Every structure is written in structure tokens, then in C-alpha cells.
Amino acid sequence: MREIVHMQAGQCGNQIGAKFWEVISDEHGIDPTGTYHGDSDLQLERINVYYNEATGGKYVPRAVLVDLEPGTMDSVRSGPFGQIFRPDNFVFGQSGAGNNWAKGHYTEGAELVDSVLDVVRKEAESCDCLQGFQLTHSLGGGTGSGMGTLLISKIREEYPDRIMNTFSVVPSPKVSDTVVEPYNATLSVHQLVENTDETYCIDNEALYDICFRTLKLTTPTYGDLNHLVSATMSGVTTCLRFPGQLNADLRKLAVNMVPFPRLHFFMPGFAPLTSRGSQQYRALTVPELTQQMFDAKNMMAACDPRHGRYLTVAAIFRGRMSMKEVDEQMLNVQNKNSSYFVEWIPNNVKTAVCDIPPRGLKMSATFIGNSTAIQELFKRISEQFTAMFRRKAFLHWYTGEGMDEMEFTEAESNMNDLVSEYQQYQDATAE
Amino acid sequence: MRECISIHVGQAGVQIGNACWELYCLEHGIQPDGQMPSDKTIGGGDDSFNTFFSETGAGKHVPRAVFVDLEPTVVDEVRTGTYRQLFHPEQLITGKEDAANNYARGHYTIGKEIVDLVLDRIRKLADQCTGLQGFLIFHSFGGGTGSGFASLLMERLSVDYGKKSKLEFAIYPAPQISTAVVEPYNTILTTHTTLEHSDCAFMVDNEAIYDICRRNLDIERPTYTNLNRLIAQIVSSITASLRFDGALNVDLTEFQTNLVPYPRIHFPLATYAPVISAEKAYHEQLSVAEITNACFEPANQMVKCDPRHGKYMACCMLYRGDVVPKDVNAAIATIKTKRTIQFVDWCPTGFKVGINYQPPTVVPGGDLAKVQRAVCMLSNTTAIAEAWARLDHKFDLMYAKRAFVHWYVGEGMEEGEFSEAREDLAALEKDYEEVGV
Amino acid sequence: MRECISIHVGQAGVQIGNACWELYCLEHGIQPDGQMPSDKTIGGGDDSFNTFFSETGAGKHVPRAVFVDLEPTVVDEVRTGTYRQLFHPEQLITGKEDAANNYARGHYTIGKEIVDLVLDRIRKLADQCTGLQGFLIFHSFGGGTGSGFASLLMERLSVDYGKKSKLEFAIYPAPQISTAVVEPYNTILTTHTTLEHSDCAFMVDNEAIYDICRRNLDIERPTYTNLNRLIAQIVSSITASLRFDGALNVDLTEFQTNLVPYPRIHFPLATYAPVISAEKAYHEQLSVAEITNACFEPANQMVKCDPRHGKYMACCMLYRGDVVPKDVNAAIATIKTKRTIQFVDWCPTGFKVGINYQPPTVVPGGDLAKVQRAVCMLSNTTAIAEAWARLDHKFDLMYAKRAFVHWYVGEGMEEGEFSEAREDLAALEKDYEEVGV
Amino acid sequence: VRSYNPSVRVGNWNEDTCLEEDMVKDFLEKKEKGELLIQKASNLRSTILKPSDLSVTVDGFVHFGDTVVIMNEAAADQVRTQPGVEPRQANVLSVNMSETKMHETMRFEGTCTASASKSLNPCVRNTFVIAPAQDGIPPGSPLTYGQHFRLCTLPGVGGNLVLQSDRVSFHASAEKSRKQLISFVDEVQSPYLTEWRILCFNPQIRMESEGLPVPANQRIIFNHCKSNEDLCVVSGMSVRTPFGREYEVVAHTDLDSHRAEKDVNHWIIKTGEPAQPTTLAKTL
Amino acid sequence: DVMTRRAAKMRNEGLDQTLLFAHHNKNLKNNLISWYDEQFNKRERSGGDQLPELRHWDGQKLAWEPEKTDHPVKGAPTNFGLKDRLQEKWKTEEADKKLSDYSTTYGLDYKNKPRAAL
């Protein structure tokens, strides 16, 4: 009866949340009308973890939907699997985020936080054994970045014991889509690093690379990129919802994965991945899955782990397999690329096995990685931030919406200190 | 009459106890519905079940077990499966959230809200007894729901009860493979404080059972269920003398006085023979001498620790089946005349021999063959000091720069307990050294 | 257990493998979609397919084949034909530009961006393979992809794997029939660079199969399909000992250690015998002596050169079907008593005989007829030196005034390699005459 | 750089053809097991929109057991006073439900809610059966004024749905213009809510006309009984239908300046004309 | 136009959970069985997937073929009965709020007991 309150703020957060609820609704047998039409009774025993019982056989998801526009939230209400949400937790604004962290964090977004926090409080005291909150945001916009981080701060202040999951679409060295991504990323990671229990940094460039190389996929659009994120989010929390020989929930993952409190930036992954021409020629087995997990091209962050060093690794295997095969596969890879692991931590791999595999796959596996190599991302964001902030580029919006440049300086210094911590915990030997 | 109480605590404990009670029901002919199949007749003469099962009125046999789990995941399968109408509903004690591989969470915060309930259930199952022998405590050293809550439970149990024996079946970590990362922290902080309140702690190692299943059972990819069945066979070979008559029987009171020379060295290793499969048992001759040599082979120990790098201090011979003590003594003489198996100079004697008449049982869809005889080593030796040395090396490697300590510290656990645990394990290593020399 | 990896290089190799894998599918009874339709419940195991087919997940058997070519439309015909959902699409590696009958273009520029990919696919197939026996490389010595890229593949495979057997089912230019003009250039530059990276180079001449299909199989207008089907029958007869069970058997190492006397002399001529249509077959009584004399007939060799102007060193002697060992022995005795067949004085015993009980399956819609007996001859005669000398004469005629050399030079190849290949082939032919005398 | 059709073997054509093959396999699966939306909509059009023969009266009065069609006249001022809203056209009361109970089970199953479609055509979704409620009334007897009856659909496709209303309570009201709801029910929870009566046109001869037989093809008033509300088109706003956009019938006693029923309160009973039993019967 | 907008919207919606991520089959029904259900709840085999207890030897893998860990139970999914219990509760909920219920707690609770209850 551990409970997760899912929240999504922003356009990208709402899209990936709608895909997440589709991928978990067809896992739990929930129809688009909301009722339970499954027949396997193993599904309808932990359905409370993400859903809430209503009249009849209907189950309303425990999701808080935030957006500062009546646009893509109406789009995800009108799309498929959009009739399952309660209309009460569709708090949205009639303004614009402006792609502005200040606009989302100190103005009209901030007077929406009262309604958002009332909805979150109702959905949190409607539980009995609340495990925590799971926010999926954009980190480069104005609703995902500013409103999301302020919601994180308020919820962390109110409940400073539950588990805070943050799925963040961190900006890429390539692509663009916004000129002030370095500002909206630094000013958000400054609050993430002090208010979040664990952060999964997904990158659209890495998702496009996966679509290139493991799925071919000439025209994947955002649907497939959100589907991979939905599959990862479903695979992380699968031990809470389905039985298994070796369970691991979010608190087990956090304890086994986060050595020091400001070291909770991961690189997620999902690796029963193959193209449509090779889906009936690839045999699902633990060594093949583990090879594709630990392959550096299957990271959903743009950081390449071969230039860094893994601090801790988590691996959750959905399906029915053999524990000796899983354990000896991780022993084999940890013996092979032993230079990619920190010396001061023995047995850098945390294993979990869940019995029920996802749809279509007989055997799936997801990967969580805390490594030094995520510091290249923050170094890049720092370089772009100090490129723009040195000349006050696009700064009058932030400082006239109501802020000071001392917040910008504090965010830059804090994220550079995070870079320094990651760098110091890389080449420091044991004895 | 020779009654005993089994507490299975943690996920590993719950799975092991599941296999153990399956084996016990098959041994005593008790259906999963808790009823005898009504064709037994006899007339009540076969009372060789009261050590593990009560008799609640019409014939419902309620096991003397407490299944404790802070998470509602692996006990709900028991509550919903075919063993649902076998256990008392509050013998399947269930928490609300798991302790998250955290000694502090399993020992102080989540431990001290269900400890009163589990002691109440143990008190009820203990005063519904007429000569209780001891407590078989099944747990893993993984941490929290396992080692942590078992530590708190035994700390309260030693205060509550007296001279009752508390045997531990502990899943010790392997030298190479393990699940958790905070595994050395949990193991050190548990072996610091359960070393004073226990009586005899068998070590079982998952890598060792994997190698046993690969080499002898020929299963290249076993799951945890095969390991649990092998552990259940170990425990059944231990407790068969309390149930079935034999040439000479050994009790739990006889057991600690035979394998604990000094109270700090109560850490034995378990070994079984034969674990050969049905495709090779009927072709290989299986008698007392070669099964004893198979047990004393270094590539059979269920701990992943070679006894060739240590001195045997004491041994528990457990035979069951059509075994004669003349061949037992001949096999023991052939063991003692071997130069590879080296004993210690202060123990010229020592092989506690028990022989039981009941042959080992077989489970449907299992692994082991129908053999007419079997033997169990329960040995106390100086080899496990190497495992303690590896565990302390891992603990110092993690604790040299305070890795993962903030979870324990902010959960409500003072930092000096880590240092005092490392003192206790250093003293354990030094004690093992001075016993060995 | 025993598996072979087949690499088909060039248009000739891809078309030969197109006939081949059809024959293997018919032999092992799998549909073109990759399924076994037998499902005989009590029987129908048939583990013989695990030599050229790999068992994937959904009951689909994929061939251990790499169809590699620098130019499309032929692997595209494979990809669009009826054998579409049989091959792995990552085993159909293609480039963008052909070598255009240029050894330098296939060995120095275009082959470099794709040799790494084909080596990665070979490594993946070898990693899936447990107990690899060797490589079967189907290419043509005529020119282009089948010369330069084949030689590059031999170089990297000898660098990586080493001791593993590498058989070359090469297509050799005819004395008179020649499609390309620079065939002597490409053939000798292939021979120079694959003379030390091969283990048995079975060349096959198109003119000889033309004569065989016209005289024996009474076909007035044979195409490449009949030639590739006969070469498929050759390779199936060679690998039938590995695939099916039977009498006295050979693997690839057994095969090569009896056919390669000297390290440079690994060039055995191939011969097949049953080559009979249905009308001539029903008025025939094919028996072991008759079909052995059919193999020893000079009009049945697959390379156009009479073996009377040469001496046999060794013969590997693969019987297949309703074959009796004393009938084989009596036949071999009769040919050894025949004075016209001349063996070499340093090889008094020269027949590596091997019998299988699985007679060949003739492809429906083909040209051969169903028989109960079959012979494959692989003989290392001292008559292929005439073919080597005639291509040496052709090369001297072209290279006398440097015709067609500017393409190689402007593509990035030196004339020193031309001179080195000329000297190496002169050394090879004088080695043949020195060993034969 | 340039991209071609996947039929052209130039680029990603192999796995593009594989993806198209998988989509075609899924499409043929839905085609063979009949979950295609085209097939569901075509089955809906074929089974619902089927002409139904009406009952031809002899003496011009409405009799019990007659099928008949509930119609409403168009607005008297069809001249466009203001550009924009169209004046209310002649329409027929019909049966509605949204998508799923149309798509599966093929029939009008349960609680429906009604509407007014502009299609002046006798049809399964818009023909009814006038049925008694007090029992003991012989079939073929005149319906008269002030006499309760039940408006039920055909016993074929439709499952004998009975008209029903409710209050303006805050759990069941019209989807637009919060008011009394007009539904079609199958279970009949309470018998009094599923019951209707007919009042005459002129509200001075009403008490004397209570008991006189009801004429068919002139304007009358449909009054509930339990709530004493009359049927209304309520134009200016429409409800969604799979067969188009239709008006929203509401029980509301609308009164003009001289406290009398307005333009949308005068519904007419249309029988079959005595030439063929389909089509309308023309007013009088 | 009012067509290219809808076409682009449905193209950007993006594939399906069966066109992506699905291998070999596209069914979740056959994989909803647990290790406890197929080990401690017996759950005998049926149909073609009846593994023999002989466990003979193979040469192509140098190991014994019928791995019970590699061939799990296929067939009916795992069922406890709380689906049927909750279905009875949902039918009770639908039988509630039926307008004409008007039933009091005394009428529900204090009824005529059967003869064998005396």
C-alpha cells in the first residue's frame, strides 16, 4: 500500500505523463473509460499505487496536471486515455509561461500554486502509506522549470520524509527549441540539487540517437520519445505494483544508489530494444539484455559514461528469468569494465527482479546510472550560462519580472560546486 | 513435546520458510488446506508433527511459524495462494513500508512499531506449547527487513525469554555477488549486535548454492526456489531427530554444547549430501563413505569458503536413512586419516553423530532424487575468518570516505555505532586467530 | 555443436548461396519463413539443423550466413525474393559502389568502410556459435567484390580467429569462356593474397559445369541456376558428415589434414556423381563401383583440365546414401589396380573415405533426379598447374605493354604488387612441378 | 539527402516496409474481428437508419398501440430577423447515446437521453409506440385528453425504451441549459416517472376537453405529470450525435406574456398517410 | 484545408505500444503468471508445454534440455478471487442508488431466519 502521487507540469511533462498513463493503463487493464476490464487477478491487487477507487469498477489516476495555458492540457484531455482523469486535477492558467523561469516562479504561476498545493494535499491525505511524489517536468521551459521547481520546494517543505522523483528533460549540446535553456536549466537545477531525492535526466538528443540506431524510425516524432520515457518510468516502479523474487522500491533504489545527498543525478535506460526488422530474430535473454543495458549508446542522457566513471548502477528486470544468470552477468560486466567503476565502492550494482514483464516483451530490463560523466552536462550548462550572463543577454526579462542577479550568481556557483563534487569523487583512489 | 518455533523475518526468510513449510507438509502428510487426508487412520499414534504443527479442533494443523515482513509483497503471495488456509492470519505479520536496505530504518523507526506485535504473537505461540525447544530464526544479512528487524527481534527475545536456544539461519553475502550496495554496512552492524544475543548462526551463501546447483544438480540457471528447497532440506536434516525415531538422536540443546567451544565462535557452516540429480543418482553408488567424502570435499561447502585454509574445530554428523553406525565410524576414520582435512590440536575428539531412521523426502517438481540416505555437515572451523576479513575490508573501503552513512545518520542512528561495530568485528577476527593458533 | 559460418562475397557468391540455402532449407525441412512445420510430438526433434541454422526465439531458425557485397540489386533481389523472412537483415551487408572488376577498388578504397561491419557481424555469429568448425567463403576469382574484398576478409579473419578452417568455394575463370577482361589480373591478385590465408581453395570452373549439365543432365540451355544448384549439391555433400550422423565421418579438420600435403598446395578439384536426369536414371543401376568410376572419369571434373596430364596426391572420398563400406573398399581397390590413374610415389595410401546414410534431396523444379547413392570427390591432382600456367600466360600477355594497369595505379595500387603476384604464381607453379616430380 | 518513396529501394526501405507490414497486419486483424470504426459506423447507419412503417388512422384520432412520430413545427417567423442563428426548423424527437453503446451490442441498451433531429423521416431512432400505463386498457382504444400513457420505442432494435424525466437536482440535468432531463430507460425504476399525458392547445376549453378523444395531426402539449412540465425543443444550442447535430429536448413549462405555452411547447403526433405507411401525414 | 492539421497531429501523436516495444507477439495475457503461482501453487501443465521429468542430454548445447527456469508455465493467468469479490461489490454498488430501494437498516438486518437456525 505504498502510494505514489504523479505530477506533471508543462507541455512536455503533460505529454510524457499522458504516455505514462497509457503505458500503465494497458498494463493494469484499465480501459479508456476508466473501468477494470482485465481478468488476471494479479493486476487488481496493487492498483491503488497509481490509481484511486471510484464508484463502480472505475479507477481514477492519482495525477496532478499543471500548465499555465489552456492548450496542450486540453489536448491530453481530448486524446486517448484522457477520459480517465478527474476534472478537478486539471488546474491550468490563462496566461503564458514565456519560456521564463521568473514568470513561472515569482508571478502568475505562483498564484496557481495555491490551487496546485490544495489538489496535491487532497491527493496526499487521501492515501494512508504515501511513498512519495513523482514530478515529470521540462527543465527548459517556464511551466516545467519554474512552477515545477517551486512545487518541488513547497512539497519538500510540507513532507520532508517521502521520496521525491523528478524526471527532467535536460537541454542538449545539439538541438535548440529555446534560447534561454541555460538560464531555465541552471536556475532549476539549483533547486533540484537541494530539494530532490532522485533525478532522472533524460535528453532528447539521446532519445533521437536511440531512435536512429536501435529503432531506425525515420519519422518517430515526440510520440516514440515519450513512449521510451513512459516505459522507463513504468519499469522503475514495477516492484511496487507487481510481485517478484527480489523486490526494490524507490526508497531501496535511493538508499542503494545515492552515496552522498547532492549526488542524485542519474542516466536512465531501457534495453529490450531492437528494430522492427529484427524483433523476431532477437532472442530475449539476460546476457543480451545486460549487454544492451551497459552499452553506452542506450543511455537516455547525452553524457557518454566511457569518459566518466560509474559510481552506482541499478538494474530492474521485469519478467521471469534466473537469478544466477542475472547475478553472474553483473559480476561478469563489473569484472570486465572494472576501470569504469569507483574503487572505493565494492559491488557497484543493485539488482531487482519483478515477475510480470510489460506488454509484448517476455523479458525486459531498465537501467539507472549514477556516474561522474553526468558532470559534462552541468559543465556545458555552466559554460553557456557564463557565456550569456557575462553580457546580461536576455536578462531584463528575468530581472524585471522580479528577481536579482544574485540568484543567477548563486545558481551558477552552486552548479559549479556540484561539478567539483562529481569531479572529486572520480579519480580519488582508496589507499 | 519437542516443540519449536520458526520465525521467518525478511524477504529471504519468507521465501525460505515458504519452501520449508512446503517440505514439512509433504513430510508429515499435511495438505495445503491444513487437514490430514482422512485416510491416515493410525489412531493418533503418529504424533510426530507436534513440533511444527498444532491441532486446532477438527484437524486443522496451524504451523508454529511467524512470517514477518515490513513490505506487503512476498507475504501477500502466501496470503493469497494455496497456503492461505494453513497459516493463522496474524501469524503472517505484515508491515506497511519496507526498511529500504537500511539498518537504522529496520532497527529504530520501522522496527519499533511492529516489534510489540511480533513479540505478542511469539508469546502466544510459545505459551501454546508444552516443552518448547527453541527458535529457528530465518533471515538474510541484506539489511532492514532482514538483518535489522531480526537484530531488534532477537534483542527483545533474549530479554523476554531465558535459556531457550535461538538458532539462526543467515544468508551470508558472497565474496563476489550481492544485491545491495550497503550490504557491508548492514552485515557489520548486524554481526556486531546479534553476536551477543544468539546461540548458533549457520551461514548459507547464494554463490555457493549456485556452484552446487551448477556442478552437482547440473542446473545451469537456478532461481531462488531451488536454493530455498536445498536450505529446507538442510533444516529438515537438522530437525528430523526431533520428529522421527532413530538409532541415536541429537537435540538443539545437544547441538550448541557440541558446536560452540566459546560463545564468540558460534558461527557454523552447513553442507549436504547427496545433492545429485535423478539422472545420475541411479547410476552412481550412494553410500556412507563416499557421501562423507563428498561432504568433506572443499567444493561442496555451502558458504563459498574453502576449509583447506583453516582448521576444523568441531563437526556435526547428521545421517538420515538406512545408515549403520559401523559404516559411520569407518567413514569418520577414513576422514580422520586424511592429511588434507586438518583438525586443531586442542580438539583431538569431536564428531557429534546423529542417525535418524526416516529417509529424506522428495518434493514434486523438485531437484533432488529419491535417495535412501543423506548426511549433513554442521561444522565449526576457522575458515570463516577469511569471510569476516573480506567483509571488514569492504566496510573500511566504503567507510573511508563516509559513503552511504548519511541515510543511517539522518534516519536516527548515531555515527559511533559504525566504529564500535568495526571494533567488534576486529575483536572477532583476533579471537578466531587465537582460537586457530 | 558443430556449426559452420558461410560468407557469400560478390554476385557469384550471393547467387551460389541463394541456391545453397534453398537446398539446406529443403534438406532440413524448414519453410522459407524460417519455421519447422514438422512438430512430430513424439519425435521431430531433429537437432541436425544446428550446423547451418541458429534457433531464435519464436521457433524461427536463421541461417549462419553473411551475404556481403559492395553493390546492390543482387542482395536486394535476396531481400525482395521469397527468402525474405529467413535471413537476418543485419546479415545482408551491402555497400553503395561496386569495385567494377577492379581488385584495387575492392581491396583498397571501397572495402575499408564495410570490412569492419562484416567483421562485427562475423564476431556476433561466432559469439552465438558454440563449437565453431570453420568458414565457408563463396566467391569468384573473376574480379571486383569477389577478389579484393574476399582477400581482405581472409586477411582480417586470419588476423582475428587464426587456427579456424577457411574453405574457399571459388569460381575460377575458364580456359576459353571469360566474361570480364581483367580476369587474369584479378585472379592472380586474389591468389597472391589468399595463398597464405586459406586452408582449402576449391576452385570451380563454369565451362566444366556447362559440359556436365549438357552431356549428363541433357539440358540444351543451362543457366547460372543449374550451376549454382550443382555447387549447392557439392557443399551439401561436403557438410553432410557434419550435419547428419552415419558411418565413418569427417569434420573440417579431418577433411583438410588429408587433402593438404604441403602448406602451399591446398587446391583440391571437386567432382560430383550422381549427375543423371530421370530418364537416364531409371535405365541405370547406380552402384558404388559405377559411381566411383564416374567420379574418376575425366569428363566429370568441375575444373576444365584433364587429370591424365598430372598425378593424384590425395583424394577425399565422400559417399552418401545406400553405401556399403566393402563396396567402397572394392571400388577403391579397382581404381588402385587401374594403371592409368597415377598416384604419386610418396603417397602410397591416399583415400580419406567417409560414408553418410542421408542421401541427397533434389530440389523440386530442378534438373537432377532422386537417387539412393552419391559420391563427392575432392582430389588434389597435379593438373591444376596447367590452369595456373595458362592464367600466368594471360597475365604476361596483358602486362607486356601495361594494358588496364592505369585504372589500378590511379585507384591507388602499385605495379610492385603486380610483379609480386607474378613472382608468387611462378613460385607456386614451380613448387607444384617440384613436388609432383 | 533527397528522400524517395519506400517502394524505391534507396534508403530505409527495408524496415519501412516491415513497419508498414506490421500496421497492415494489425489493420487486417481489426478487419477480420470487426473492431474497425468504419465497420461499426456502417453497421450503425444500416441498422438504425431503417424506414419503419407507421400506423394509418381511420377516424383521425390517436389510438393506443399506434406507432406515430412526435414532431414539432418550425418557427412562425422563418424570416431572418438577425443574420446568424437560423430559426428553428421542423424536427422529430429521437433517441441518442454517445459512442460506445452504439459501437458494441448494436442496440439501444440502457439510459439514453433524447434529442430533436432535423431529419423528418420515420426511422427506428425516432418512431415510438404509445402504450398504456394503468393496465386493463384495450389496444386500439382512443388515447383522449388528460389520460396517462407511456412513450416507448419498438420491441425490435431498441429494447422497448420508455420515456422518463427527473428534477433539476444537482445530479442529473440537461448537458446544456441546466433544467429537467429527458431520458430513455429500459429498467423502469419507478412507474410514475415513466408516464406522460397530452393537453389541448387552447387553455380555456381544457377542462371541458378532458375526456374528449385526441386528434392526431394538430398541435398538442406533452405534459409529464410528476413535475408538470411540457416538452420543448430549446433551440439556439445543440447536443452531439453520431448522426449530426440535434436540438436538446427539455421538460420546462415555458410561458409567454399571457402565461401560455410558447412556440417550443406544441408538439404534434404524425401518423402514416393513407397511401403508404411510411413518411409523414401532413398537419391540419 | 482543415485536413493537413489533423494529419500532422495524428502523425505527431506517434505509433503505438504494439508497433513499438513489442517483440515476437503482442499479448500480455500469457505472461501474467508468477513464480509462486507456478511453483508453490502446483499449476500443472496442459497442451504442448508439458515438460518431461526424464531430462535427457543434448549435444548441441552440451547440457540437459528441459530447463524449468527457461520454459515457465503458459496458459491461464494468475487468479486469486478478489477480482470476483470486487465484481460482486461493483454489482452491489450498481444495485444501490436505484431510486426505488427505500430500504431501512432494520429491514435489512432483522429478517426471518431459516428453520435450521432455530
Ligand SMILES: Nc1nc2c(ncn2[C@@H]2O[C@H](COP(=O)(O)OP(=O)(O)OP(=O)(O)O)[C@@H](O)[C@H]2O)c(=O)[nH]1
Ligand atoms: N538464498 C536466498 N537468498 C535470498 C532470497 N531472497 C532474498 N535473498 C537475499 O537477500 C538479500 C537482500 O535482502 P532481501 O531478502 O532482498 O530483503 P530483506 O532481507 O527483507 O530486507 P529489505 O530489503 O529491507 O526488505 C539479497 O542479497 C539476496 O541474496 C531467497 O529467496 N533465497
Ligand SMILES: Nc1nc2c(ncn2[C@@H]2O[C@H](COP(=O)(O)OP(=O)(O)OP(=O)(O)O)[C@@H](O)[C@H]2O)c(=O)[nH]1
Ligand atoms: N557459378 C556461377 N558463377 C557466377 C555466377 N554469377 C557470376 N559468376 C561468375 O562471376 C564472374 C564475374 O565476376 P563477379 O563474381 O560477378 O564480380 P563480383 O564478385 O560480383 O564483383 P563486381 O565486379 O563488383 O561485380 C564470372 O566470370 C562468372 O564466372 C553464378 O550465378 N554462378
Ligand SMILES: Nc1nc2c(ncn2[C@@H]2O[C@H](COP(=O)(O)OP(=O)(O)O)[C@@H](O)[C@H]2O)c(=O)[nH]1
Ligand atoms: N520528449 C519530449 N520532449 C518535449 C516534448 N515537448 C517539448 N519537449 C522539449 O521541451 C523543451 C521545451 O520545454 P516546454 O515544453 O516548452 O516547457 P513549457 O513551456 O514550460 O511547457 C524543448 O527543448 C523540447 O525538446 C515532448 O512531447 N516530448
Ligand SMILES: [Mg+2]
Ligand atoms: Mg524486502
Ligand SMILES: [Mg+2]
Ligand atoms: Mg557485382
